[PDB]
Amino acid sequence: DKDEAWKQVEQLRREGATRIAYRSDDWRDLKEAWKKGADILIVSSKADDYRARAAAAAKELGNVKPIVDALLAEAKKARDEAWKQVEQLRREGATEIAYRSDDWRDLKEAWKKGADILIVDATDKNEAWKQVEQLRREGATRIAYRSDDWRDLKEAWKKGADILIVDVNARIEKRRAVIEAEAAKAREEGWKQVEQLRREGATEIAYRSDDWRDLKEAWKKGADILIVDAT
């Protein structure tokens, strides 16, 4: 939980890591990691999930109106809460707020609320690349993209994305001793993505994990941002 994840930020700062990231939904939890040494504070909301599930519910048979409104109402409350966390962290002194979403207009509003790093996390590659281009034309400077393939991050790099997040903790969770063996096979993959991105010349490479030794090793391979993710 909290005190177990905060120990990861303290260790990276202990070992001389100058770019540490932390992901949470509570601004108080993010502020504490900010004092532990994390410079990028990532706010995440369940709003994309509620929108995805409201969209799936609309394609079912029968009366869908009361259920769709209930899901979209929760999405509004989830995003209006995340925007509050961005303001509160800005109110506290946090300089590098990040926000992840699959809707670029939610990213644009978070950018006006105080977020500096915009994380596009659209599953469709051509849908994400369009969201980058749309954010670029609005004047957004720091666009981040998340993928488990380095070639997707290089293509996103050439579209305007400055931060390239290597995330492989989504395929291991889907495939699932033994369970720890498959986790290691994914970490060996994620470390290779960072290596080739450094070879290709990627300037700002990030890496998602929850263990400081995994972020340390990805830091050895060439990761510039060590993201600590509690969820």
Author numbering: 1 to 176, 188 to 242
What's the publication's text?
Within the crystal structure of HalluTIM2‐2, the α‐helical extension at position 1 is resolved entirely; it forms multiple crystal contacts with itself. The second extension at position 3 is not involved in any crystal contacts, and one helical turn before and after the loop could not be resolved. Notably, for both crystal structures, a significant number of crystal contacts are formed within the resolved α‐helices that had been optimized with proteinMPNN. Upon comparison of the obtained crystal structures to corresponding structure predictions using ColabFold, we observed an accurate prediction for HalluTIM2‐2 with a root mean square deviation (RMSD) over all Cα atoms of about 1.2 Å but found major differences in the case of HalluTIM3‐1 as the RMSD over all Cα atoms is over 4.1 Å. In the case of HalluTIM2‐2, the theoretical scatter curves of both the crystal structure and the predicted structure are in overall agreement with the experimental data, with a χ 2 of 2.6 and 2.4, respectively. However, around 0.18 Å−1 both theoretical scatter curves diverge from the experimental data, suggesting a potential high flexibility in the extensions, which is especially conceivable for the partially resolved one. In contrast, in HalluTIM2‐2 and HalluTIM3‐1, a major pocket is formed through the introduced fragments above the C‐terminal end of the inner β‐sheet. These pockets show differences in size with pocket volumes of 1006 Å3 in HalluTIM3‐1 and 2000 Å3 in HalluTIM2‐2.
In this work, we diversified a de novo TIM barrel by extending multiple βα‐loops using constrained hallucination. For the diversification experiment, we used the de novo TIM barrel sTIM11‐SB as the base scaffold. This variant contains a stabilizing salt bridge cluster in the lower part of the β‐barrel (Kordes et al., 2022). Here, we introduced two or three helical insertions into minimal loops in the de novo designed TIM barrel sTIM11‐SB.
